[PDB]
Amino acid sequence: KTINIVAGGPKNLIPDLTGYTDEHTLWIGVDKGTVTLLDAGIIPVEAFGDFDSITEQERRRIEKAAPALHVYQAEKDQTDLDLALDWALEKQPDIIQIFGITGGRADHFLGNIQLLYKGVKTNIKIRLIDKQNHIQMFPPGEYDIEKDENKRYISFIPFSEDIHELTLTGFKYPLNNCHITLGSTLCISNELIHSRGTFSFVKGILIMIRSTDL
Ligand SMILES: Cc1ncc(C[n+]2csc(CCO)c2C)c(N)n1
Ligand SMILES: [Mg+2]
Ligand SMILES: [Mg+2]
């Protein structure tokens, strides 16, 4: 099953959620995010955070449209989003997808990025999504990707430590059992030259950004 979380970032950086709706995909709203869900026509099963960020009318509008909507509050020491993720990881879905993850405040995004770290610990696919990016972290292993018709760039960035024996295949910029040192931006702006591409490394935490220039 799939769980989709919509955090409270600005709506303009968020994709069409509609096309992400499916019979095996539950939704949950976080902060303004639950408001975003209602506008799109999706009702959250649960909602996390408080209302000090949502408007008077906005609250009424939610209540009218979702009376039995339960809202779990945070403890100021854990982000609303951060809290929603525990609820979702617990459910153990094959995939968690988060939206409203980018915005004006950089801290916001930088945070969400750390959230992905909690996902490798639980070996559960956690993909972050916005209008032009798909972020995902991977532990050592061997992974396949398909060419993306709308986003042509695929970047790789080391996380906790150095990346060991990184191999890229089906990419414009190949790599064979390469050692990527922490902080390196060599593996940014790559592309797929085939229909399927493969990448793999033996040690470290790798980040993968698939993007577009619009
Ligand atoms: C493994 C690997 N991946 C991507 C690039 C290409 N690249 C690196 S930096 C950048 C943007 C600035 O030119 C681009 C396109 C490479 N050389 N090696
Ligand atoms: Mg929208
Ligand atoms: Mg708050």
> How far is it, in rounded angstroms, from Cα 130 to Cα 210?
11
At position 101, the amino acid (one-letter code) is I
Total domains present in the chain: 1
At position 183, the amino acid (one-letter code) is G
DSSP string, 91-147: H--SEEEEES---S-HHHHHHHHHHHHHHHHTT-EEEEEETTEEEEEE-SEEEEEE-
Ligand 2 centroid distance, CA of 157 (Å): 29
CA distances from 9 to 13, 33, 118, 204 (A): 8, 7, 21, 30
Q: 95-99 and 2-6: which strand pairing?
A: parallel
Q: Which residue has the tokens 């980018």?
A: 102
Looking at residue 130, which CATH number applies to its domain?
A: 3.40.50.10240
Ligand 3 centroid distance, CA of 75 (Å): 9
Ligand 3 centroid distance, CA of 111 (Å): 14
Among residues 94, 97, 168, 147, the alpha carbon closest in space to that of 127 is found at: 97
Mutate to test the pocket of ligand 1, among 167, 179, 187, 201 (most ligand atoms within 8 A of CB): 187
Measuring from atom 7 of ligand 1, which residue has the nearest CA? 189
DSSP string, 170-204: SBSS-EEEEEEPTT--TTSSB-BSSSEEEEEESBS
> How far is it, in rounded angstroms, from Cα 211 to Cα 134?
7
Say if CB 84 and CB 33 are below 8 A apart. Answer: no
Domain that holds residue 133: 1-214
Cβ neighbours of 196 (radius 10 Å): 11
189 lines ligand 1 (CB under 6 A): yes
Residue partners of 169: CB distance under 8 A and separation at least 6? 197, 198, 199
